[PDB]
Amino acid sequence: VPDKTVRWCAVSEHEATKCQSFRDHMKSVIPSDGPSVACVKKASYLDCIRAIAANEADAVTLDAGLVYDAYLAPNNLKPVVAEFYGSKEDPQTFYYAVAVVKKDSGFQMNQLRGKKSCHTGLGRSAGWNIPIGLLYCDLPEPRKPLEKAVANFFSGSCAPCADGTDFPQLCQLCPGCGCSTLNQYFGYSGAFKCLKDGAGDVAFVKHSTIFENLANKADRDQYELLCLDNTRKPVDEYKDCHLAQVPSHTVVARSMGGKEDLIWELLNQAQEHFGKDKSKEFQLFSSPHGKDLLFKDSAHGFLKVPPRMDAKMYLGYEYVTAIRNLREGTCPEAPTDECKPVKWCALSHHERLKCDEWSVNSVGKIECVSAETTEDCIAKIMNGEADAMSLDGGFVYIAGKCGLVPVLAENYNKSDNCEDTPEAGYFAIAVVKKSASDLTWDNLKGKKSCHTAVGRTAGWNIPMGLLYNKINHCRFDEFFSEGCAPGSKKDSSLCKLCMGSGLNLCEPNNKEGYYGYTGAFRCLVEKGDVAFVKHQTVPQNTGGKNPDPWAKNLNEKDYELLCLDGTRKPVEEYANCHLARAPNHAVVTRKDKEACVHKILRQQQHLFGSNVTDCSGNFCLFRSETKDLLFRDDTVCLAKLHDRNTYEKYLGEEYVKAVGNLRKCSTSSLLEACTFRRP
Ligand SMILES: *[C@@H]1O[C@H](CO)[C@@H](O)[C@H](O)[C@H]1NC(C)=O
Ligand SMILES: O=C(O)CN(CC(=O)O)CC(=O)O
Ligand SMILES: [Bi+3]
Numbered sequence: 001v002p003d004k005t006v007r008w009c010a011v012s013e014h015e016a017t018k019c020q021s022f023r024d025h026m027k028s029v030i031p032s033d034g035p036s037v038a039c040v041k042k043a044s045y046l047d048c049i050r051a052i053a054a055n056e057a058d059a060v061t062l063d064a065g066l067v068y069d070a071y072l073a074p075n076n077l078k079p080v081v082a083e084f085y086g087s088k089e090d091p092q093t094f095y096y097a098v099a100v101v102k103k104d105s106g107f108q109m110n111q112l113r114g115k116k117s118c119h120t121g122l123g124r125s126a127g128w129n130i131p132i133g134l135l136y137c138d139l140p141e142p143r144k145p146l147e148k149a150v151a152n153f154f155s156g157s158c159a160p161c162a163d164g165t166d167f168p169q170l171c172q173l174c175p176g177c178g179c180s181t182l183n184q185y186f187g188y189s190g191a192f193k194c195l196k197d198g199a200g201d202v203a204f205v206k207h208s209t210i211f212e213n214l215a216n217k218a219d220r221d222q223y224e225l226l227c228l229d230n231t232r233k234p235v236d237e238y239k240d241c242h243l244a245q246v247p248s249h250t251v252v253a254r255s256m257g258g259k260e261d262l263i264w265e266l267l268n269q270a271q272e273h274f275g276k277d278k279s280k281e282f283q284l285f286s287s288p289h290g291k292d293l294l295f296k297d298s299a300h301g302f303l304k305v306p307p308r309m310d311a312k313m314y315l316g317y318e319y320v321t322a323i324r325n326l327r328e329g330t331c332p333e334a335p336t337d338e339c340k341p342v343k344w345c346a347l348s349h350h351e352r353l354k355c356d357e358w359s360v361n362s363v364g365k366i367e368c369v370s371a372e373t374t375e376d377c378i379a380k381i382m383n384g385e386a387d388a389m390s391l392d393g394g395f396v397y398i399a400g401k402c403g404l405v406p407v408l409a410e411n412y413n414k415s416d417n418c419e420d421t422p423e424a425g426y427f428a429i430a431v432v433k434k435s436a437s438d439l440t441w442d443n444l445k446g447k448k449s450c451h452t453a454v455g456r457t458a459g460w461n462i463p464m465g466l467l468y469n470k471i472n473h474c475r476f477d478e479f480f481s482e483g484c485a486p487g488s489k490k491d492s493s494l495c496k497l498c499m500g501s502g503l504n505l506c507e508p509n510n511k512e513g514y515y516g517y518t519g520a521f522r523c524l525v526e527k528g529d530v531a532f533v534k535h536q537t538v539p540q541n542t543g544g545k546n547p548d549p550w551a552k553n554l555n556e557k558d559y560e561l562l563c564l565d566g567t568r569k570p571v572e573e574y575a576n577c578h579l580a581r582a583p584n585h586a587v588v589t590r591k592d593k594e595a596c597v598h599k600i601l602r603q604q605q606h607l608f609g610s611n612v613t614d615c616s617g618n619f620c621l622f623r624s625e626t627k628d629l630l631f632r633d634d635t636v637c638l639a640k641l642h643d644r645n646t647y648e649k650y651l652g653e654e655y656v657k658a659v660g661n662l663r664k665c666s667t668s669s670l671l672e673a674c675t676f677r678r679p
């Protein structure tokens, strides 16, 4: 072990004093092979951000506004440790900015113009920056000076700390706009009282503000929340009806070489020795020198930020949109009004080439973005860099936990009424070679497995779910001797059978030849003992239908299916010999893009679907015909979902529990990140 010092950045002489006490008390209880603190004193939060980027410091705790500023070039900082504020069993790392109104006041979010508004204070986050950022494009021009545009948007307001001389209407509800607690409508409790008293029609406040100023649910039922989709929901449903979800206080560090593990090691040790009510000699969350030095006085401890989290993901799509609007002070030109370009997310260069062709044929209505993993693509849809992609049910689940919604299903059964007929799903199966007569589902231990990719339905969740129920541990790489399960940790025995070159080895994309249904079947033919795939994989790749050299000579009847009862059946007897049902793949998008995506794709499939006779020369959306590029190759159409518009309602209770039973065996860094934000 070499250097274990975290250089903490302080922003004032008082912080610098507390940091020094922090270093001293840690040196007295932590041994020499443990973490230590060093203190660098700067003059502002921005100077700390700059110093960290320039490798002169390592850590500083920031409000969300500065976490945003810290992420921008050329700082490139990321969140690494979170302060939490509730119980250790119910940590409250985030608040929810909300718009509270009285029940039955008869207006939605898109009708806030002409209303009386209550704010916590000018330039405050929940009470100003967030709602004003979100309303920005609805404000009348000129939008700056901002206070003037807002004063013209609302009929009257309380905005503490605002200039009452230049902008009198901002003070109508609190004459003088007193920047202090002597004003009854100042701050969180004050802005809520402004609403409670009938002075304002809407208060912009934290979700916690309501819960701490009202005794009861009966009290809370007298109020409502404004949702971004122009509906109202009960106050208790703030998780589903907020303006933005916002981290309270975040330790940030360099994106590269930032010492995140050491920063957590330090802070995890500090909260154990000197955290809430732990020590009398030193307190992490108080000080004789003042409030909120280094960390907030209301903090109860720290939680580690999941590694896959970047600032955009951490702050959330809603918060980023608001702050960008305010920071750059410029609007895209309304109306216009048009949905047009859906940005499709393609998985690496193989999918990107089919997507490119689609884009040119769609004539402006489809555009393309690339990422190297499904999870990177899902992250791109979350942050707004992409809008849609099709997904295996396993990744529909992950996407759903990440707040995405299914809009249309891939359908596989040919029918005169494809678009309007929901399918129960395909079958997950375990394929083996007939000549390998020994193999039974009863004992697959010490054998070699081939999987579409980790996290996928037929390739992973179903069979590994069933395996986990039998052996009751997650070490599937010890159960099997070796295999190919693309997406596995690189030193895992479940990467040893994969065929990709160099850095492509075991990657979950088509640069890895054993990725996906066809690839998993190839793996079985060449190296493996069992393949976990869909029921149609074998016939799609046998009898000369796959013309590639490895598949050319393969016969359907040389393969069998493993049944659950320990017997074997031929390939076409999948209906009586399968592991489980598998919900169809589906297109997912942001809740705010659901309608435009639904519209565009229905139009798109009408032009490039199954209606096209000659698929040579004309563009076909549903053909690869080997690698399931963009959509599965056996896709007949994209089907309506009607009310099956959430991941839980789409996938069904049966498959949702199954994946949840595997929650402990999850290597998915994206899922860890999403469930940290929404547990
Ligand atoms: C699709 O497949 C199922 C089961 O194989 C079959 O019963 C059904 O008739 C097919 N048609 C439709 C429209 O789902
Ligand atoms: O609103 C602000 O500007 C102050 N801080 C936190 C605080 O001081 O409570 C940002 C926030 O509320 O996220
Ligand atoms: Bi605040």
Ligand SMILES: [Fe+3]
Residues within 6 Å of the ligand: 392, 393, 456, 457, 458, 582, 585
């Ligand atoms: Fe699948």
